[PDB]
Amino acid sequence: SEAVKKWVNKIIEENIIAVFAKTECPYCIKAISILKGYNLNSHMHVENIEKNPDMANIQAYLKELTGKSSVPRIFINKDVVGGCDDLVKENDEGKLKERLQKLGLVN
Numbered sequence: 001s002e003a004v005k006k007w008v009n010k011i012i013e014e015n016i017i018a019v020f021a022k023t024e025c026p027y028c029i030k031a032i033s034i035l036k037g038y039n040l041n042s043h044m045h046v047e048n049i050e051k052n053p054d055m056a057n058i059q060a061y062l063k064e065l066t067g068k069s070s071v072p073r074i075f076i077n078k079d080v081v082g083g084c085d086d087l088v089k090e091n092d093e094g095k096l097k098e099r100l101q102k103l104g105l106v107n
């Protein structure tokens with residue numbers, strides 16, 4: 001579905017930080033909390049793709065874009081971060097802060 005890809009794309013392209021999640025998902029919650037800890041709320045969108053009639057289509061497209069169909073799936077300025085484990089690696093190693101600095105999102 002062109003429609004599903006266009007919908008996913010609009011989420012990624014109109015929000016600097018885009019997180020695809022599902023219901024009662026501990027690593028989604030952890031990833032979102034880490035990002036909100038950088039005070040990124042105003043430029044974040046979280047989409048619950050389980051509460052969606054086209055979840056499988058969305059997951060397959062996210063896999064085409066990122067290599068995995070699992071949630072959370074995290075994009076920053078359209079760049080693929082990946083999942084929560086990828087976010088933790090970037091956070092601990094300074095890469096996340098560098099990304100956000102280059103976007104003007106953290107001083």
Ligand SMILES: [Mn+2]
Pocket residue numbers: 024
């Ligand atoms: Mn349950």
Ligand SMILES: [Mn+2]
Pocket residue numbers: 036037038039
């Ligand atoms: Mn804060």
Ligand SMILES: [Mn+2]
Pocket residue numbers: 015044045046
């Ligand atoms: Mn939003």
Ligand SMILES: [Mn+2]
Pocket residue numbers: 045046047048
């Ligand atoms: Mn939404």
